[PDB]
Paper text:
Different from cation-transporting P2-type ATPases, P4-type ATPases act as a flippase that translocates phospholipid from the exofacial to the cytofacial leaflet of the lipid bilayer to keep an asymmetric distribution of the phospholipids in the biological membrane, which, together with phospholipid scramblases, have been implicated in many cellular processes, including blood clotting, membrane traffic, and apoptosis. Among all 14 members of the P4-ATPases, only ATP9A and ATP9B, belonging to the P4B type, do not require CDC50 protein, thus functioning as a single catalytic subunit. The catalytic subunit consists of 10 transmembrane (TM) helices in which the phospholipid-binding site is located and three cytoplasmic domains involved in ATP hydrolysis. To address this, we solved cryo-EM structures of human ATP9A in the outward-facing E2P state.
To obtain molecular insights into the transport mechanism of ATP9A flippase, human ATP9A was overexpressed in the human embryonic kidney 293 cells, purified in the presence of the phosphate analog, beryllium fluoride (BeF), and then subjected to cryo-EM structure determination 1. The phosphate analog BeF is bound to the catalytic Asp391 located in the 391DKTG motif of the P domain and is shielded from bulk water by being covered by the 193DGET loop in the A domain (inset), indicating that the conformation of the enzyme is fixed in the E2P state. To our surprise, however, the cryo-EM classification analysis revealed the presence of two distinguishable conformations in a single image dataset obtained from the same sample, which we termed the closed and open forms, analyzed at 2.31 Å and 2.18 Å, respectively. In marked contrast, the luminal half of TM6 takes up a relatively straighter conformation in the open form. Due to the TM6 conformational difference, there is a space between TM2 and TM6 of the open form, in which we observed phospholipid-like EM density. Although the EM density indicates the presence of two acyl chains, the headgroup density is not defined well enough to allow a clear molecular identification. Still, since the dimension of the binding pocket is large enough to accommodate a PS headgroup with several water molecules, we hypothetically modeled PS into the binding pocket. However, the PS molecule, modeled based on the stronger density for the phosphate group and the part of acyl chains predicted to be in a position where it can interact with several hydrophilic residues, including Asn341 located in the unwound part of TM4 and Ser346 in TM4 and Thr882 in TM6. In contrast, Arg849 is located in between Ser346 and Thr885 to segregate TM4 and TM6 in open form. Due to TM6 rotation, Ile877 is moved farther from the canonical binding site, and Asn341 in TM4’s unwound state is facing toward the phospholipid-binding site to coordinate the hydrophilic headgroup of the phospholipid.
Numbering used by the authors: 33 to 434, 450 to 1044
């Protein structure tokens, strides 16, 4: 696409455009129709392992290098290509089908004839789109009109930026005042919008109406926007579409899907490179021993083609089928139900994760806040003691019909029920009209709405205890008592919450009594000095914060009438002024905020998902570092980190201060370096500065931390953190998220896990693995990833060992029997054909386990051995190479030594000994025996015996039915295998593996 430019969007009239806009389609698939085959082929053959077979097959076009039949070169290559292409096509088709669900959602569109239904994928720039309550916004729009009489709406944006606060949105003032929504099409208005960009929290634009005789222009900000991926909290809204498809704010924060390859596959590719290099060195030495007798290059080519099975195609086939088995097993595990595998070629990545970068909102939490603790200083009330609070309120409001603990409880509850910015919203339950519910205060139709979910939880709790907030206006508030009596309060003044003040206040007058009261609630740090002297605020606030709760200090100051008049006069005088209005107003308000009576401390919990603490503990014990990358704000992120035990209860936490330039960043980095065993909490902008100037120093300090929390993290910042971890540590990272702001870091990570979000699916659709709950991560790693990694390592190493043993056997057979002849090549091919009788026993290794699933779950320290690369390394590969050379040499030399009679006898003895040796080798390798492995072994042995019988009768051979053959094969197999059995027994007895203890 071309460089982004500002657009003029006319309301309605999508045809009025200076360019063509992309279709409003969310796309997660890696290929289209045109790029599918070239991309799949390139990603297949760009690696040496596949390109080697491709070039081996292509060399047979030259008649000088012809060796054997063409189909022997092309049928296995074609089968591998077909398997890869079918797998990729199935993946793409499933991705398209799953995208159709999001793209086929139906919305209402304003038209001249009326309202019509439109699918999400058919939305055009300039369409007037109706979005209902709790419905996802399908495209980036400007808020124009709402049905609610307050002239505003709340947006849930956690799928877009990971923030728990509800966003208050205001419609365009001109369009909201129109008598009907149909008048939007009868005016000549347009929106001049900025170019499509990546910033989620800023927008620059203008609304212009040319129909009015005086032209009307309105500046547009982020407060007038409804981005795609947000959810309308209540009411039905109308907006004009500005951006669609790939230019959506959510989509522009999303990277292109990529084809991932596992680290194990790269290691296998390196092993194949090493094997080919050894073969080429051997060919060079062989041709040098002949002193390059002429046409030496041709002889080198024939040697490479003759021993080309040293890199067997069966390695690739077995690995592909094994990955199929692992994905099938993951999709059918009922202990982690609903798990979806999308990147089916990387199940072994789950076994080697060093850093887990997790999202907070919607991944660790349920995005549901609950009131948990009420503390009065002398008595604390929890979830089990709320009955006492209810009884206290009941007695307080019964005595009036008919100091003390009841009075203090009542004052605290009334303060919580009044000091907030929550508005009761009444809806329709079918029978009852919206106006009827607002008149009788119907509980079932009442919904509490506020930007702060903590305030909503507080008001809901006060409802559960007896004091119900039933109505609120700009100047009035109504409370319902346990005696169904309404108390009317007049909102004289309100001081709305700001993140800089970290507190909120209100002044009310009780009309039933006439007394004026000033209420304030806020964080402990700011409210400690505001309240009177006490001996329990700091300690109790510390304990409640350590529990993981969001703590608020609730205070109260009774105001005399004259005091209120004086304050009101000074406040009005400060407000009417224009010079330092904010500062003078602050002087007045914090002049009012002093010597307040401390009422209570409140504790609100952001509820964690099921088994989050055990899952995090399991990940920690396995050697995995867990970082929290969230778009939410500092306080909630810290509270959740403590609640989830991402940070230990008695663990120091360093909160990175605001830094704006290089010097401040260096100073704070030194300050944090001076600490030990301290968790790190840093915001997105300070992180930006630190990564700009001190990326290496910050990365080493953060990797030396027990835990890192990055709050207010933009999606690009999350992806950058993932990339920096990969670049610095050199280890695998796994990103876990649930929202659209996690897609970039999921795609960037070596193993992306998407949690199915409550109101969005983009993270699940873009991830390598999709889970329904965070706790499924523990099993998905410790059982499935471990087993996949170990099985792949064992299977690949055994296939390579078998091919190497065959190569050694045929090298000895060619060098010691006849040097060069046609029957020599016949025996070469016969020896090569021995893998058919060991195929099923070898592939039965995909059923092998070292421990049961419960043992792996209960002992996470087994994962650290995987983190060290133990299953596949140079040591195990070298041991396998030595074993293969020894066994091949022993079999061939025993065949040529014991009975040198003929080609037939030596071939038969070596073939039988090799088959028996590989069967015993499979038996020796198995850790936990599955009945299917026994079936494979016995079936392969029976098939070989049947081959020895079907051949004995027809071709004239009687040498099989002889004691000589029996005992010679027995001795050869014993010499090949028994040393390995003794070595295995000694290794098990002396230095057992950690999982056996
Ligand atoms: C024990 C070890 C001792 C070693 C001592 C020295 C030995 C020297 C002998 C050989 C050295 C040259 C070949 C080495 C192996 C290839 C290494 C290599 O640098 O690989 C280059 C790439 C594969 O890189 P990658 O997989 O890491 O990519 C991953 C990165 N990514 C995918 C993003 C690109 O591409 C390739 O493999 C191209 C590789 C060269 C062409 C393949 C030749 C073999 C194929 C067939 C054999 C002959 C058949 C006839 C061929 C001609 C027909 C006319
Ligand atoms: C044969 C040619 C290769 C075909 C490979 C693709 C099979 C895809 C497949 O067969 O789709 C998965 C379904 C069930 O998937 P689900 O609905 O449980 O996923 C939530 O069957 C399965 O699991 C079995 C497939 C598991 C392996 C997928 C490819 C691994 C490489
Ligand atoms: C017969 C002659 C020789 C047999 C050789 C056996 C070696 C290969 C075995 C592959 C296999 O047996 O695979 C097993 C998996 C999981 O089954 P399980 O035996 O662990 O069940 C455990 C329950 N117990 C114990 C009752 C069985 O099933 C699977 O992956 C099924 C594979 C899914 C293929 C989907 C293709 C999509 C394209
Ligand atoms: C059509 C056939 C496609 C195909 O897979 O080729 C068959 C491959 C061949 O490789 P090999 O076993 O090492 O045999 C060496 C042989 N003599 C050679 O020179 O090439 O052998 C294989 O790759 C077959 C492996 C099957 C493993 C089990 C699959 C699941 C079975 C249940
Ligand atoms: C090379 C030839 C001799 C290999 C012989 C294959 C057969 C006979 C061997 C190989 C693996 C063996 C099995 C390995 C595991 C078990 C489980 C336990 O209950 C002991 C018997 C039993 C069931 C063995 C029976 C014999 C067995 C099936
Ligand atoms: Mg989230």
């Amino acid at each position: 696409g071309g460089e982004a430019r500002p657009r003029t969007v006319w309301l309605g009239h999508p045809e009025k455009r200076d360019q063509r806009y992309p279709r409003n389609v969310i796309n997660n698939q890696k290929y289209n129709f045109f790029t599918f085959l070239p991309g799949v082929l390139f990603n297949q053959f760009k690696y040496f392992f596949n390109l080697y077979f491709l070039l081996l097959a292509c060399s047979q076009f030259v008649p000088e290098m012809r060796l054997g039949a063409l189909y022997t070169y092309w049928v296995p290559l074609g089968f591998v290509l077909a398997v890869t292409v079918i797998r990729e096509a199935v993946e793409e088709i499933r991705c398209y089908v799953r995208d159709k669900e999001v793209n086929s959602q139906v919305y209402s569109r304003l038209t001249a004839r009326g309202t019509v239904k439109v699918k999400s994928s058919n939305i055009q720039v300039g369409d007037l789109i109706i979005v209902e309550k709790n419905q996802r916004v399908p495209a980036d729009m400007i808020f124009l009109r709402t049905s609610e009489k307050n002239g505003s709406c709340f947006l849930r944006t956690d799928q877009l930026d990971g923030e728990t606060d509800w966003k208050l949105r205001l419609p365009v003032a001109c369009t909201q005042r129109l008598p009907t929504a149909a008048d939007l099409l009868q005016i000549r208005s347009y929106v001049y919008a900025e170019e499509p960009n990546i910033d989620i929290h800023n927008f620059v634009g203008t609304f212009t109406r040319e129909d009015s005789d005086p032209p009307i222009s309105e500046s547009l900000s982020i407060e007038n926007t409804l981005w795609a991926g947000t959810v309308v909290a209540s009411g039905t809204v109308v907006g004009v579409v500005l951006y669609t498809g790939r230019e959506l704010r959510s989509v522009m924060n999303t990277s292109n899907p990529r084809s991932k390859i596992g680290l194990f596959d790269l290691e296998v590719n390196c092993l194949t490179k090493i094997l080919f290099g050894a073969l080429v060195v051997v060919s060079l030495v062989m041709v040098a021993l002949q002193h390059f007798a002429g046409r030496w290059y041709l002889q080198i080519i024939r040697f490479l083609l003759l021993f080309s099975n040293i890199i067997p195609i069966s390695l690739r086939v077995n690995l592909d089928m094994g990955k199929i088995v692992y994905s099938w097993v993951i999709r059918r595990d009922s202990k982690i139900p609903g798990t979806v595998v999308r990147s089916s070629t990387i199940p072994e990545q789950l076994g080697r994760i060093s850093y887990l970068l997790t999202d907070k909102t919607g991944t660790l939490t349920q995005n549901e806040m609950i009131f948990k603790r009420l503390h009065l200083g002398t008595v604390a009330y929890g979830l089990d003691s709320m009955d006492e609070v209810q009884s206290h309120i009941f007695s307080i409001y019964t005595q009036q019909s008919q100091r003390t603990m009841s009075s203090r409880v009542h004052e605290a509850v009334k303060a919580i029920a009044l000091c907030h910015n929550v508005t009761p919203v009444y809806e329709s339950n079918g029978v009852t009209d919206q106006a009827e519910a607002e008149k009788q205060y119907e509980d079932s139709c009442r919904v509490y709405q506020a930007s702060s979910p903590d305030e909503v939880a507080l008001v809901q709790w006060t409802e559960s205890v007896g004091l119900t907030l039933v109505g609120r206006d700009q100047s009035s508030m109504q409370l319902r008592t346990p005696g169904d009596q309404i108390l009317n309060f007049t909102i004289l003044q309100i001081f709305p919450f700001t993140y800089e003040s970290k507190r909120m206040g209100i002044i009310v007058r009780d009309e039933s009594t006439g007394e004026i009261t000033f209420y304030m609630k806020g964080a402990d740090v700011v409210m400690a000095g505001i309240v009177q002297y006490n001996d329990w605020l700091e300690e109790e606030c510390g304990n409640m914060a350590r529990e993981g709760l969001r703590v608020l200090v609730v205070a109260k100051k009774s105001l005399a009438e004259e005091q209120y008049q004086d304050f009101e006069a000074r406040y009005v005088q400060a407000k009417l002024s224009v010079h330092d209005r904010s500062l003078k107003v602050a002087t007045v308000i914090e002049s009012l905020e002093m010597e307040m009576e401390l009422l209570c401390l409140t504790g609100v919990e952001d509820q964690l998902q099921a088994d989050v603490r055990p899952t995090l503990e399991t990940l920690r014990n396995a050697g995995i570092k867990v970082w929290m990358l969230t778009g939410d704000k500092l306080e909630t992120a810290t509270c959740t980190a403590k609640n989830a035990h991402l940070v230990t209860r008695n663990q120091d936490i360093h909160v990175f201060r605001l830094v704006t330039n290089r010097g401040e960043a260096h100073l704070e980095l030194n300050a944090f370096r001076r600490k030990h065993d301290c968790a790190l909490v840093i915001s997105g902008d300070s992180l930006e500065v630190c990564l700009k100037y001190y990326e290496y120093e910050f990365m080493e300090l953060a990797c030396q931390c027990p835990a890192v929390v990055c709050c207010r993290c933009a999606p690009t910042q999350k992806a950058q953190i993932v990339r920096l971890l990969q670049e610095r540590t050199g280890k695998l990272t796994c990103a876990v998220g649930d929202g659209g702001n996690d897609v970039s870091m999921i795609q960037e990570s070596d193993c992306g896990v998407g949690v199915e979000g409550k109101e969005g699916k983009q993270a699940s659709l873009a991830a390598d693995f999709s889970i329904t709950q965070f706790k499924h991560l523990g099993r998905l790693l410790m059982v499935h990833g471990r087993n996949s990694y170990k099985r792949s390592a064992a299977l690949s190493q055994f296939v390579i060992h078998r091919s190497l043993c065959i190569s050694t056997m045929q090298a000895v057979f060619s060098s010691v029997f006849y040097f060069a002849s046609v029957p020599l090549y016949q025996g070469f091919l016969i020896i090569g054909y021995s893998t058919i009788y060991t195929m099923f026993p070898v592939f039965s290794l995909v059923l092998d386990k070292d421990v049961k699933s419960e043992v792996a779950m209960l002992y996470p320290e087994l994962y650290k051995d995987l983190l060290k690369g133990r299953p596949l390394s140079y040591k195990t590969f070298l041991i396998w190479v030595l074993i293969s050379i020894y066994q091949g040499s022993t079999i061939m030399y025993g065949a040529l030594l014991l009975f040198e009679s003929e080609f037939v006898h030596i071939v038969a003895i070596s073939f039988t000994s090799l088959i028996l040796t590989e069967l015993l080798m499979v038996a020796l390798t198995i850790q936990t025996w599955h009945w299917l492995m026994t079936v494979a072994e016995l079936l392969s042995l029976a098939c070989y015996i049947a081959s020895l019988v079907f051949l004995h009768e027809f071709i004239d051979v009687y040498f099989i039915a002889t004691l000589s053959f029996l005992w010679k094969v027995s001795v050869i197999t014993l010499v090949s295998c028994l040393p390995l059995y003794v070595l295995k027994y000694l290794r098990r007895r002396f230095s057992p593996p950690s999982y056996s203890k």
